[PDB]
């Protein structure tokens, strides 16, 4: 009945939503496509879709 706070798991991929309270900043990261710019395209679309809320 014990687990580490930092799961730091694997066998998956995502956009990794996260926030940093130290500097009051949100953090999203890239993982799906091989090139960096295709990921910039995907996260830019995710940012636009984020603002539909």
């Amino acid at each position: 009945a014990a687990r580490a706070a930092a799961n730091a798991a694997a066998y998956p991929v995502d956009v990794e939503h996260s926030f940093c309270r130290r500097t009051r900043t949100a953090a999203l990261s890239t993982a799906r496509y091989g090139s960096r710019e295709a990921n910039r395209k995907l996260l830019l679309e995710h940012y636009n879709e984020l603002l539909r809320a």
Partner: peptide
Amino acid sequence: GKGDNRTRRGKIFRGTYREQLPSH
């Protein structure tokens, strides 16, 4: 087994009280 099967202690001996992290 130091209570290997049914304890809150012997299951840290059998590596189960630490739940195994999902990895591969």
